[PDB]
Ligand binder design. Sequence first.
Ligand SMILES: Cc1cc2nc3c(=O)[nH]c(=O)nc-3n(C[C@H](O)[C@H](O)[C@H](O)COP(=O)(O)O)c2cc1C
Ligand SMILES: Cc1cc2nc3c(=O)[nH]c(=O)nc-3n(C[C@H](O)[C@H](O)[C@H](O)COP(=O)(O)O)c2cc1C
Ligand SMILES: Nc1ncnc2c1ncn2[C@@H]1O[C@H](COP(=O)(O)OP(=O)(O)O)[C@@H](O)[C@H]1O
Ligand SMILES: Nc1ncnc2c1ncn2[C@@H]1O[C@H](COP(=O)(O)OP(=O)(O)O)[C@@H](O)[C@H]1O
Ligand code: SF4
Ligand code: SF4
Lengths: 684, 684
Amino acid sequence: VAAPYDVLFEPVQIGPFTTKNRFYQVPHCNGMGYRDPSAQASMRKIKAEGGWSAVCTEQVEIHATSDIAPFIELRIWDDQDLPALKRIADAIHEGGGLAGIELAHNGMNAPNQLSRETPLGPGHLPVAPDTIAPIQARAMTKQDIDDLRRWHRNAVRRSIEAGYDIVYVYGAHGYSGVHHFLSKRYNQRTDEYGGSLENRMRLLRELLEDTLDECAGRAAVACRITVEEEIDGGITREDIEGVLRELGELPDLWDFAMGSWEGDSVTSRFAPEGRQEEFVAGLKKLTTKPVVGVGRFTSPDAMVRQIKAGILDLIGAARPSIADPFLPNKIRDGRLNLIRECIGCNICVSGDLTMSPIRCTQNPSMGEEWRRGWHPERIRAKESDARVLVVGAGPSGLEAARALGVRGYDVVLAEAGRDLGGRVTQESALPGLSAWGRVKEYREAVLAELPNVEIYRESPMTGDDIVEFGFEHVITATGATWRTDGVARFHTTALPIAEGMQVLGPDDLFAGRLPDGKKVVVYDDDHYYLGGVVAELLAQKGYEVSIVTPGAQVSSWTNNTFEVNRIQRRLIENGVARVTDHAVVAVGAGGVTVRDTYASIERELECDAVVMVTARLPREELYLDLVARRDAGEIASVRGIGDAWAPGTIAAAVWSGRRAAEEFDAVLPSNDEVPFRREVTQLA
Amino acid sequence: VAAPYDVLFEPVQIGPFTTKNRFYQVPHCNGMGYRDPSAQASMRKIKAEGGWSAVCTEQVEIHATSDIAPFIELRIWDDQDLPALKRIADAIHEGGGLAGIELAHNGMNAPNQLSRETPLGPGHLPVAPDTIAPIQARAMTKQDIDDLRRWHRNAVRRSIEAGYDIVYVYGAHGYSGVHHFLSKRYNQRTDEYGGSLENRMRLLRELLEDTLDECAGRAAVACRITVEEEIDGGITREDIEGVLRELGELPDLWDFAMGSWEGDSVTSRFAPEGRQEEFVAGLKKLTTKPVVGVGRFTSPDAMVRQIKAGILDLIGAARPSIADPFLPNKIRDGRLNLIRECIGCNICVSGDLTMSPIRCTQNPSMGEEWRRGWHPERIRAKESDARVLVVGAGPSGLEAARALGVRGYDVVLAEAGRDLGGRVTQESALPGLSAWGRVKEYREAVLAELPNVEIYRESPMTGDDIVEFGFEHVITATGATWRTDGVARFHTTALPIAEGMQVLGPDDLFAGRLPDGKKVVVYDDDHYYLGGVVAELLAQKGYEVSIVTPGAQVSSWTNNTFEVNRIQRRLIENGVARVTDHAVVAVGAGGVTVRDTYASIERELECDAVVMVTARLPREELYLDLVARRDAGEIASVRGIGDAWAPGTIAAAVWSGRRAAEEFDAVLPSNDEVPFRREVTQLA
Ligand SMILES: Cc1cc2nc3c(=O)[nH]c(=O)nc-3n(C[C@H](O)[C@H](O)[C@H](O)COP(=O)(O)O)c2cc1C
Ligand SMILES: Cc1cc2nc3c(=O)[nH]c(=O)nc-3n(C[C@H](O)[C@H](O)[C@H](O)COP(=O)(O)O)c2cc1C
Ligand SMILES: Nc1ncnc2c1ncn2[C@@H]1O[C@H](COP(=O)(O)OP(=O)(O)O)[C@@H](O)[C@H]1O
Ligand SMILES: Nc1ncnc2c1ncn2[C@@H]1O[C@H](COP(=O)(O)OP(=O)(O)O)[C@@H](O)[C@H]1O
Ligand code: SF4
Ligand code: SF4
């Protein structure tokens, strides 16, 4: 490797092992935990062979008192968990990588809703944080602490038996007993485990020493540690420095992380690349040992920076690794222009928070590797001589055309408007969504290296043109329009709209049209990002803006992306009125009628204009026109794709297109069958 | 069987099969879907053994387009699911009952977050109801309806293979495609599946006929249908009546239920027993087939009335059957005083919505039958001649005593107060909570029939007493008190409280004390029921009330028990102000300072009094004392349980009490091991 990037491929000693390079995939969930272990093995194996030197598993509950149901992570309670763990460690090895396992006791943060065990913590407190479950933790005695230590030790043993190279002590994200013992916020103990740094670090020390003694140099010991909590009384700079000074010589590796998962995986919308830096700068100097840090790292020169300036030894990533499993190899090979950069959407997390195998906006193969055999980079050779027309160049069209391109097909990509990108382009122009543009960039950067793909950019297409042009196969990727009649979830049918009121939708704002008068009401019955984003826009542009939502919070689905609090603070700071728990039930000439969701009390709200952000209808005129022409015999295949088939997130659109690409000319089972593989429960 | 109740023990023909009696357990979820098949088997067998003539599984997804993850129900996608379904039906049979299977396709209610397949519905809409997933359902074509019909046919085949006696076409709760086709709220179609009632009923007709053909005298065909949806253009009395005029003679059994699950499983806090009669009356005359219905039926007289008045043929029950699997046998045998009545807490539902095996406040063995060997009625016999002291007659100590009592142990139950029941008594007295006393009545009923248990009211106990009387084995069920320092989740350490202000906790209210002046602030950081119920008590007494809570809704955890909307509604009607998204960060002499949770903005709120509803500290002074004395060789054993151990719900305390009793005198595995049996994933 050369240029300035050779720095990123130096070996690093971690205890008795050596990395091939400085790329480190840190522990991250996957929504396919104790429940889809083959799925995980396949994925982790792909990260390894993509160039990540160490590959970590998500956290792994060491004991049934660490039950965090409904969350589905990995488990190491018993020898019954071994075969699953061993497969993952095996798959990473055979992929060329060192395997990491993040042993975890969630302590006071485990509600134990499934095991029905008592949670254990430093104090008698409601289970916390990131949960409001009606259960309290019991304060641990010395005997309980000794019990915890033994469970941890058993878990480490079993990690050696499974073949892991790196075994963590986990003390990060408010999710660990160890963090709760460290933090003045949860530890108000008065015995030797509380009261002062030396004491609050006691448990940490003990778990470290125990893990070391138990490994006996057959594995390395990592410690993943909270470095900044971002709350009063929480872990600060002073604490982390004291820990490093006393214990810095103890593990084989120090992984640095935020005291909060909200804080750790913040979206691009709310944070730039490498923001963890000024919480971590200065810490390397304190330890003989190597250091990993994160910072949504996508730019290879930012990675170069982190190492030359002595902030980090390993470049850690979670999400960058999900977006592009092959990021290390693309840097290796000089093809930097082909890096699929994380968008920082958070969609990946929402899989975990909805106990689904995590989706990536950028990488449709995430969670398809085992079950459908998809690959982040490769796709089967073309099975035919076909010429395919993809109509519409939004996320779904772009990905169909990219993937069919990569297969070797002769593909013509037709686009109606001046620009490529569809909703990605219209959406990234919105406040705080600039990075989303990257979905379009990667696809263009790869399309450019495909001579077999023709792109035509000011070319609307009708069923007529397609037949006249003689196109035998079409993929119809035409998108969706935003309803203006007020229908989504609260109304399933049009609400009444007086003739005198200006009513716009997102199509109008994307087209550059803006409300006429000063006061605007945005009716948000979508509950994801767009309502809030549109309202941001209007207020920046000088309008007086109210959001009306049937939810108790604006953009309530963002609970699933950890954005919900940030969204609300951001709305309150732009002076936007949050009119939550209300539906718009009438639009009159000079205002709207809102109805409270709980008691149906109605009120008038005066305004000069109304912007509807509710739901969408597919652009399927072309498709239905072509199905008619297929039945008649004038073409051989049409397939609807993306938002024109059934509107969803951008990720779903991207996925939708890759699916069409992988399925083109495939001989398929009838749809009676499950279109993927799955593991099922082992009967006793 | 005694002469009033003998009618409930008459055989009822259900296609090819005959019930032993009229007790029918309707479909209900359990949080052990495809994940824990054996647990469910043990639970369904016990129900059959309890005298329930038909026992049904929860809804079974028939296809991967019907994926309702994160909810974890059963599946029948294909043959890999058969071993698991076959075990459930064999268990019911071994139990002596008929096995039902609720085959269901969720259509547009299926967000498909795990399958990533396109949801299917009568039109292009966002997935609904009760989900805000960013995904829309595709409008089915005739070809999609033929596909669906075929998938349902396949599932019926497989149901018969697995050995089920009754097979449902499911059209209820707004959770199936059948209901969305049937309801004008979701069906706006103009082809043969919409417009007239004849048309919207057509899918149902078609699935009914197909299911009957496929069955062919091998299984009975049940139809579970929405009789009232409780919303504007939804299904109503004229709709179901017409369905019955035309279709009444098709299925073998009609199962009548509500049009939303909020509507169907209504808490007893919000609805009396038999609430669904205003809705099913008159429908039985329109069909010759047997008819099942639910009403949270716990009163045997109420049951005799349903049958005698021609309302039902079968007494349907979900939650009453969870609270008491052995309810039919108790009535048969004439032991009506031993029935454990549902309290209408919905704590069970909370299992489904948090993807955990369901708990029941009344029945701590629900969820434990397989994994720990518990039984709702049988406890294994005493293993020694021991004499046990149980201090505290709250839920915890009552169930321990009752359980130890049934084993044959000599037991002494000492209680400090005039009353038994502890928090059950104190809390039952609160508005809407009276049914919760049934927790105590049940245990009193069984204790009355146990000469080997002795109960001392008005007997506060101390360390010296106990040792003095020469008790060897003590269970300390002493409870917890509610904190008045402001600590729970938002604060982990005390907030500042001015000397001049009156501050009350729930313990004061239970004791008879009420705030001194007219204006009251309730700080609620408990997030479950008590704050809102406390606020309702005060409004009812003439106080002017404000509830301040960091959640976006008052009682936010009641999202999990389907009361959250009802609760906000009831607070508005009582004129209680909802200061949501706020914490109390200071209590001054004539008001409080509140801090907005998002943007950190503080207002003052003036009041004459503050009632703190936050969290709890255990009353464990006695246990700590006896632990000392145990280590002096003065007693042989002590165990803290219930809220004295770690505060929780009433259900957790009951469970805790039963756990102490099942565990008594047993040889236990080290706590290193998993305290229960458990199934893991089958590696492929
Ligand atoms: C889908 C998702 C799941 C993750 N789960 C965990 C976890 O199980 N263990 C943990 O310590 N960190 C977990 N994290 C945090 C990551 O390890 C990482 O510290 C964080 O995502 C920031 O790094 P990034 O910018 O590379 O994403 C999770 C983050 C992601 C994206
Ligand atoms: C834990 C829980 C799970 C349920 N799940 C389903 C279900 O899978 N399908 C359905 O038909 N009804 C389900 N229900 C509704 C019940 O079948 C029943 O109609 C409702 O609980 C009212 O009857 P009850 O008053 O006897 O509880 C569920 C209810 C509860 C208690
Ligand atoms: N008849 C048509 N011919 C060519 N392109 C079209 C036609 N109708 C729509 N388009 C283009 O299809 C694209 C749809 O993209 P988008 O709205 O992002 O959909 P998706 O989210 O499915 O990718 C838009 O860029 C639009 O300009
Ligand atoms: N020292 C004592 N001796 C006897 N009874 C006690 C003593 N301390 C507390 N109790 C009783 O124990 C009961 C605890 O009930 P409760 O608070 O409902 O706990 P749980 O929910 O665990 O049952 C109360 O009725 C209280 O009077
Ligand atoms: S889903 Fe979004 S935030 Fe997650 S890895 Fe992919 S691009 Fe990054
Ligand atoms: S949890 Fe409550 S409502 Fe449910 S079956 Fe038990 S007592 Fe009944």
